[PDB]
RNA sequence: CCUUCUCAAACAUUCUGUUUGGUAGUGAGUGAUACUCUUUGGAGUUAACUUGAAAUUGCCUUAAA
């Protein structure tokens, strides 16, 4: 099996993989981290976020620390992550090493600051993670401040990105990018080969192709909230005394942060899961919760990808996330699952009940929609009175806010949500500590 | 003289009895005088020097501070006077306020808003939070401001006065 | 007494009758309903009752609504000048013993003032269930807490004697706190021919309580009030019989 | 063309034909002053209708206060189209509870107890859920 | 431009105990279950709900001038 010791690569690189709690690597792992060794283009296919995170990743930090001293200036390596969640996240995989040093590492997203950005782009950030439009921004702007010197090349979660309305985008990056010795890459998990003929640029030779390898005995609950502030009494959920396992969707790591920290507040058990953990305690949590029948636990599209807990009595679909592909039919989660029982609710500022019927246009017949309050008079000031991050400063739950509204910010035709409407105008009727949120 | 219609609206203010109720509320607010925070912390001082603070409350009076209230959007009322020596300054308040959706108010004199602030002059002075107390009174308050000076007043907007 | 073995197979026989498959808090309160000739006549009084009991459903209502929808918890009212006195965290200390908390103790002085504004004042009050209050203010709440919160046996507070002879100390809050929790199921006695004291949940303790409690409770008001018929049900219940006394009916013949 | 009365909405506790008529006179001398009052538990549904001279008078002090403010009220009052004639809400108060009973002997009334509980058992037969006594 | 019944006795001497008393509402409306009544007179009473103190026609002068 894979482990640290054969690589013989540097102390710290390996020395910190082993403060992430994993004795050894897996077999898509080892399917592929020794044989990419090479200049040998790898293009990944394998389980849906199997950990390959570390598989494609270990090459930035190996070619890059054999060439730590040079340019250091000139960005040594560049993955492209579309979605703004996973992107995020695989940078929180980017934090992966406190015994990384040689090298820095650009958030390159839809929504952040770009002042901010390249701001922060005229250091020579060493690694950088991207999402590719803005990325067009600023190599047609900051290029000499950055670009010429790149060694390898990524394209991670290919999914969407070699899907149409990225194209331009890709075709013109890579027509753009030094590929004399860059190093091509383009990385999934499991995507078509349609991606070969749309991949016919940047492949030259030495690749090969590596495989490892809704459900109706289940129905997807339904709700409809029309307040956009919409809050939910788990306790009615949980007047099981205690006793439930629950398994909560929501948006971003800042965002399960907040509702982690209020939601504590208002005393339920409380476990939660994003990409600021690191993988310490990702693993306590998780696994804690498959040592947990009594509770629940938040997670985004993290904890999306194929990780087990049996039987959850209820999925929580809450501000629905990225991608109808996994939230169709990743449902196999609980029937046909580990044949576990429960369903799955979905809570829905109104307008965008075609959504809905997107999802009835994938032809699933659905039922329930039952009557939550909205005017739960507590729930109203039992939040925005009470004061906590933002009570920490004037910069915080804002930032849960903040958010909220730039995950749901980067979906416009991917989602129903209207360019005029409640995308992103109306939804701003949950904006603050303040209300009516106008 | 025909006078442009961004001015003009000064000289519709509040009546009789919409002010008198106005500063019925507002003189619970008097920021605190100078000797009593020299007072204050004079008792505290020995107190500390020998031998738990609830958010104090006034209302937010300076000009600069005013408009920063605004335009985050903070305040809840605003007061603006008929008078100002420069009439320049305010001039842009009365527009601003609207687009924000302010609940501002125009009352006669700069003596009479200075003097419930321990001022000589104000010209504009405002609140946003309040204490629980007369949070009824508040939502009546600018209830109160929208209903008899909002309403019908919309035609003061057009119309050259003079 | 009256017969155990009837109002027992009522109980469990009225399990049958809730086994059936908010709504639900609606179902499933028992309660206890008693008549009489007339009840106290020509006065409209508020006057609450400190019932003694097998014991209390308080404890049941606390820790099996500590996973519930609303949530209940408690008050008390001081008086005027006894607040600086008794702080939050003197009291604290004691009350813990039979694990039972207050939150929040007011003067009516912040009723009439702060939470005044109907709208602040019923939503200050409803999303209580038990209360507390002092006898000296009680007298003084009538017109504070206005014409809502009278209408929940709820809300309506219990009053209570707390001051000691003379100048109170704190000694009997500590310990009659206790006395109006544990033994004590306060009950309210208005006009007309028709009085409901609400009793329990059927989803707390084995009807081995209830059962006690019927007869306690019902012999308890039998003595005093001189009553005509005795029902139980389930807050939809049609009535569910006990003890029917035609023997003191006819003291309505006594007095016409 | 409107009417003379004047709606007003919006009467806080002590307002009534004293201060009614008391004040409204100011605006000339009034036909009429109803404030809606409660049918038991004496006090008041917190509007109530007017009319002065002519339409004029209703025109004058309809304006002059229709935003008015007072303690905690503003109070809404204008006019109504033509006619509307006031009709009804006279003046109520809180009527006592008048106690006629019980003119029988427990004859038929204790009967009524019998048969009553009888035929009661017979409804708990009907539920059906069997019971005794 | 108004400011709210914030306590009694009795009993027994215990850092408190025992016991009986003393409290008429802003209104509007939701309402499925009963009690009770009396000759239709429907009267008093029965879970618990919404609410910006929301609305439409239930027969003393010194707190002056």
Redesign the pocket.
């Given at each position: 099996v894979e482990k640290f010791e054969e690589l013989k690569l540097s102390q710290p690189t390996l020395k910190a993989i082993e403060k992430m709690g994993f004795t050894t690597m897996t077999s898509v792992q080892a399917r592929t981290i020794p044989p990419l060794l090479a200049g040998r283009d790898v293009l990944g296919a394998a389980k849906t976020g199997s950990g390959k995170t570390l598989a494609f990743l270990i090459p930035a930090i190996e070619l890059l620390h054999s060439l730590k001293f040079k340019p250091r200036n000139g960005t040594g390596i560049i993955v492209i992550t579309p979605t703004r969640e996973l992107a995020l996240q695989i940078f929180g995989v980017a934090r992966e090493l406190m015994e990384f040093h040689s090298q820095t590492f650009g958030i390159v997203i839809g929504g952040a600051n770009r002042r901010q950005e390249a701001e922060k782009l005229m250091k020579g950030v060493n690694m950088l993670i991207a999402t590719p439009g803005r990325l067009l921004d600023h190599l047609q702007n900051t290029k000499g401040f950055v670009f010429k010197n790149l060694k390898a090349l990524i394209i991670d979660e290919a999914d969407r990105i070699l899907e149409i309305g990225f194209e331009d985008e890709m075709r013109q990056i890579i027509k753009i990018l030094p590929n004399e010795d860059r190093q091509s890459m383009l990385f999934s998990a499991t995507q078509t080969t349609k991606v070969e003929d749309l991949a016919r640029i940047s492949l030259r030779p030495g690749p090969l192709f590596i495989n490892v390898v809704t459900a109706d005995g289940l129905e997807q609950g339904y709700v409809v909230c029309d307040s956009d502030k919409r809050f939910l009494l788990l306790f009615s959920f949980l007047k099981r005394n205690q006793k439930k396992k629950i398994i909560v969707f929501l948006s971003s790591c800042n965002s399960v942060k907040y509702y982690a920290e209020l939601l504590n507040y208002i005393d339920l058990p409380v476990l939660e899961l994003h990409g600021k953990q690191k993988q310490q305690k990702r693993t306590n949590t998780f696994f804690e919760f498959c040592n947990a029948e009594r509770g629940i636990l938040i997670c985004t599209d993290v904890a999306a990808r194929g990780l087990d807990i049996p039987a959850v009595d209820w999925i929580i679909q809450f501000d629905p996330p990225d991608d109808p592909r996994d939230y169709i039919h990743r449902v196999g989660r609980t029937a046909r699952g580990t044949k576990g029982k429960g369903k799955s609710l979905m809570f829905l500022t109104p307008n965008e009940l075609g959504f809905l019927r997107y999802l009835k246009a994938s032809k699933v017949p659905l039922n329930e929609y039952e009557f939550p309050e909205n005017?739960i008079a507590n729930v109203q000031s039992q939040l925005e009175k009470l004061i906590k991050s933002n009570y920490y400063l004037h910069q915080t739950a804002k930032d849960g806010y903040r958010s909220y509204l730039q995950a749901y910010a980067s979906h416009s035709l991917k989602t129903v949500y209207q360019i005029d409407k409640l995308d992103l105008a109306k939804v701003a009727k949950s904006y603050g500590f303040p209300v009516p949120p106008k | 003289l025909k006078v442009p219609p961004t001015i003009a609206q000064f000289q519709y203010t509040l009546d009789r009895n919409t002010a008198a109720?106005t500063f019925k509320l507002f003189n619970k607010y008097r920021p605190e005088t100078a000797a009593e925070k020299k007072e204050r912390l004079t008792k505290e001082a020995a107190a500390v020097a020998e031998g738990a603070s609830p958010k104090p409350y006034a209302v937010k009076y300076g000009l600069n501070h005013v408009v920063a209230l605004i335009e985050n959007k903070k305040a809840k009322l605003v007061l603006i006077a008929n008078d100002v020596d420069p009439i320049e300054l305010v001039v842009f308040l009365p527009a601003l306020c609207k687009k924000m959706g302010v609940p501002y108010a125009i009352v006669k004199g700069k003596a009479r808003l200075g003097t419930l602030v321990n001022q000589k002059t104000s010209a504009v002075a405002a609140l946003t939070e309040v204490r629980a107390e007369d949070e009824?009174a508040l939502?009546?308050l600018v209830?109160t401001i929208d209903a008899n000076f909002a309403d019908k007043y919309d035609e003061v907007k057009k119309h050259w006065g003079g | 007494a009256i017969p155990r073995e009837r109002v027992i197979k009522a109980v469990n026989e009225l399990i049958k009758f809730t086994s059936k498959p908010?709504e639900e808090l609606?179902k499933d309160?028992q309660?206890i309903?008693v008549?009489n000739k007339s009840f106290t006549g020509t006065?409209?009084?508020?006057?609450?009752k400190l019932l003694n009991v097998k014991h209390s459903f308080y404890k049941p209502w606390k820790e099996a609504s500590a996973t519930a929808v609303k949530d209940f918890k408690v008050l008390l009212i001081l008086?005027?000048s006894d607040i600086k006195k008794v702080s939050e965290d003197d009291l604290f200390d004691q009350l813990d013993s039979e694990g039972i908390k207050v939150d929040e103790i007011i003067?009516?002085?912040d009723l009439?003032?702060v939470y005044?504004?109907?709208?602040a004042r019923?939503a200050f009050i409803?999303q209580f269930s038990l209360i507390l209050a002092?006898?000296?203010?009680?007298?003084?709440?009538?017109?504070?807490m206005?014409?809502?919160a009278?209408?929940?046996?709820?809300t309506t507070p219990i009053?209570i004697?707390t001051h000691?002879?003379k100048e109170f100390?704190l000694?009997?809050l500590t310990?009659?706190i206790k006395?109006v929790y544990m033994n004590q199921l306060p009950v309210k006695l208005?006009?007309?021919?028709?009085?409901?004291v609400?009793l329990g949940n059927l989803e707390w303790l084995r009807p081995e309580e209830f059962v006690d409690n019927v007869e306690l409770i019902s012999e308890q008001l039998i003595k005093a009030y001189q009553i005509?018929?005795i029902?139980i049900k389930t807050?939809?219940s049609?009535?569910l019989p006990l003890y029917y006394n035609q023997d003191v009916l006819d003291e309505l013949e006594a007095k016409k | 063309e409107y009417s003379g009365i004047i709606?007003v909405?919006?009467l806080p506790?002590?307002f009534h034909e004293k201060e009614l008529s008391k004040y409204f006179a100011q605006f000339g001398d009034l036909k009429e002053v109803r404030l809606?009052?409660?049918?038991?538990?004496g006090?008041?549904?917190?509007?109530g209708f007017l009319e002065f001279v002519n339409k004029e008078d209703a025109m004058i002090a309809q304006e002059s206060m229709n935003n008015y403010?007072?303690?905690?009220?503003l109070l809404?009052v204008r006019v109504?189209p033509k006619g509307?004639?006031?009709?009804?809400?006279?003046k109520?108060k809180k009527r006592v509870?008048?106690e006629?009973?019980?003119?029988?002997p427990v004859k038929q009334?204790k009967d009524?107890?019998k048969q009553?509980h009888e035929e009661?058992i017979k409804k708990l037969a009907k539920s059906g859920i069997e019971f005794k006594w």
């Open positions: 005017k | 109720e009824a939502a009546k209830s | 908010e609606k309160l309660l309903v008549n006065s409209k009084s508020f006057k609450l008086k005027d003067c009516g002085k009439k003032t005044k504004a109907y709208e019923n409803s002092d006898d000296s203010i009680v007298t003084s709440l009538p017109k504070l206005g014409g809502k009278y209408n929940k046996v709820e009053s004697r000691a002879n100390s000694t009997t310990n009659n006395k208005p006009r007309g021919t028709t009085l409901n609400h005509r018929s029902f807050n939809r049609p009535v | 709606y909405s919006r506790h002590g809606a009052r409660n049918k038991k538990t006090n008041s549904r917190h509007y403010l007072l303690m905690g009220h809404q109504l509307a004639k006031i009709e009804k809400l006279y109520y509870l008048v006629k009973g019980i003119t029988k009334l009524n107890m009553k009661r």
